Amino acid sequence: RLGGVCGSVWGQNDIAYRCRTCENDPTCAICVPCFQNGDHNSHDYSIIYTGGGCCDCGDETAWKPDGFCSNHK
Amino acid sequence: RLGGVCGSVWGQNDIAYRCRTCENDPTCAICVPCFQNGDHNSHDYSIIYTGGGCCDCGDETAWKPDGFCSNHK
Ligand SMILES: [Zn+2]
Ligand SMILES: [Zn+2]
Ligand SMILES: [Zn+2]
Ligand SMILES: [Zn+2]
Ligand SMILES: [Zn+2]
Ligand SMILES: [Zn+2]
């Protein structure tokens, strides 16, 4: 749609997605809804336990733009 | 062909198409190539300046499927 940066904050034991294909570095991660509203088919992704943090979807300095979801472009 | 969701991101002054017949709501839009590879003949469409955003072609939650292009079905 006509045009963000994902807020979402995780608590200590909240899950998220790591995507080794899209991440800017290994400490990056995106929340589950952003993972599911993007395209990671051939990608080397994994569910992780975050230990806390915030979703990088929409932040070109933390995540490759081709890995952004529908709502953060 | 045997079987997507359009990536395309617009910058601030990039043009796209609005189609009032196909849009899920007034903030939806599709890129020019997807507009031209679909069927909008009787439709109430307009060229717009996007202010940024991403193409909704292929996203049934942002665009009516009969307005999808050749490559996003
Ligand atoms: Zn997110
Ligand atoms: Zn997102
Ligand atoms: Zn990915
Ligand atoms: Zn498109
Ligand atoms: Zn399309
Ligand atoms: Zn249309």
From Swiss-Prot, chains A, B:
Result of knocking out the encoding gene: Reduced seed germination potential and inhibition of seedling establishment by sucrose. Exhibits abnormal shoot and leaf development. Increased tolerance of seedlings to submergence and starvation.
Zinc finger (UBR-type): 4-73
Disulfide bonds: none
The family this protein is said to belong to: Belongs to the E3 ubiquitin-protein ligase UBR1-like family.
Role noted for this protein: Ubiquitin protein ligase which is a component of the N-end rule pathway with arginine specificity, and functions with the arginyltransferases ATE1 and ATE2. Recognizes and binds to proteins bearing specific N-terminal residues that are destabilizing according to the N-end rule, leading to their ubiquitination and subsequent degradation. Does not participate in degradation of proteins with N-terminal Phe or Leu. The N-end rule pathway regulates seed after-ripening, seedling sugar sensitivity, seedling lipid breakdown, and abscisic acid (ABA) sensitivity of germination.
Protein name per UniProt: E3 ubiquitin-protein ligase PRT6
Annotated organism of origin: Arabidopsis thaliana
Residues of the full protein shown: 119 to 188 of 2006
